[PDB]
Symmetry: C5
Subunit: 103 residues, 5 copies
């Protein structure tokens, strides 16, 4: 079991860490069929999604996907600094696997 987001990210293929150390610039969410997702951006233009739940996800991830969208929304609204994102780089927009917040 990892102790931080960088080591967690390294337990997966097709992932990378992005260091933001910034608040979220915009928060988008959709209830439209087959596009039940969230998208965040940063002022540097960087865009990330929480993927639509699908075949790629194991059952244990379903609650965690919902939690992540909850986390992004409240981080956005409270202007919380996002430290790092672990993302999958075989999706466009890059898909969030993990988030760290500090400072």
């Amino acid at each position: 079991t990892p102790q931080n987001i960088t080591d967690l990210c390294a337990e997966y293929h097709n992932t990378q860490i992005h260091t933001l150390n910034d608040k979220i610039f915009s928060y988008t969410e959709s209830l439209a069929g087959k596009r039940e997702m969230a998208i965040i951006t940063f002022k540097n233009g960087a865009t990330f999604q929480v993927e639509v739940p699908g075949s790629q996800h194991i059952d244990s991830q379903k609650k965690a996907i919902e939690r992540m969208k909850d986390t992004l929304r409240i981080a956005y609204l409270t202007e919380a600094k996002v430290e790092k994102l672990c993302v999958w780089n075989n999706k466009t927009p890059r898909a969030i696997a993990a988030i760290s917040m500090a400072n």
Copy 2:
């Protein structure tokens, strides 16, 4: 997968984007049977709903409808600026498909 609300909106028939760049003026929600819905307005009078769930919705959208009502309520209470709404034109009030929020 789309990277922003405008492109997402364009993936659906008979939708449009409204640009508000304003906080929500009023928030209404109902538990009354067959009217389990939310209604928001802006100061210009513009009125939008989250639809009552029905057969027009696929299963994957049901959780997202609930999340959207959560989002609208907290956006209202925090006076968060709503950037755009993607809506369906064939409902009255216009039915929300997606929301974006930015400073």
Copy 3:
């Protein structure tokens, strides 16, 4: 579909609109068996309930009853102005069907 709380209220028998234009004065909730309910009051003493779920509710209302209690608690805690309540007047305390919030 209605566009505001007043029109929604009028789609039901046994209802009335209360215009409060005030924050909630007190919030009460109970987990006691057969009394799993919330009660709110306003400054003038006027009292309203979210009813115990029961056979007078259809299945689609169960989630909306839980949402309404969520709404009333956060409205109370944030001192959000309640504009109107739509209530059923064939219950004591008057039973909330819908709420609108506006400053």
Copy 4:
């Protein structure tokens, strides 16, 4: 149906009202097995629990127990004044049945 917490409390055996008119001093919660519970204290030392869900509860209470723990956490974090608690006094710590909050 009762109009207030005092009248509600009187509908049950083994209960009493505590009039606190104070914020919560401490909030404790546990996920440990068979001790999935919350405990609050007040500055006067008074201590209360939300009981572990069990055989003493009917199914309609399960969602209300979870809601109560949510309420106590947010009341704690926002320093909301608790007016009264209705508690079962045949338990140690005294077990919360209902809460009222007023400025």
Copy 5:
């Protein structure tokens, strides 16, 4: 039934109390499959997890694990002082069993 986190923690093997009396320094959350977890740190470098749900957990603990991640997120965002953690010491990072907040 215990009356405080210290006595609760002593009902379990392989647990200990850490006294922090500090806000959470960082909050990390993951939706990655098999690492659906949260990690917190304190400025003294201490690191704790909420374990991935699994067979070491009885069914009643699953809702309480979700609640705990909710609690840690909002405690982080509000800079709430954590008084004590009860943690299992047979896990790395040490795994949270209970939390207390005061002052």
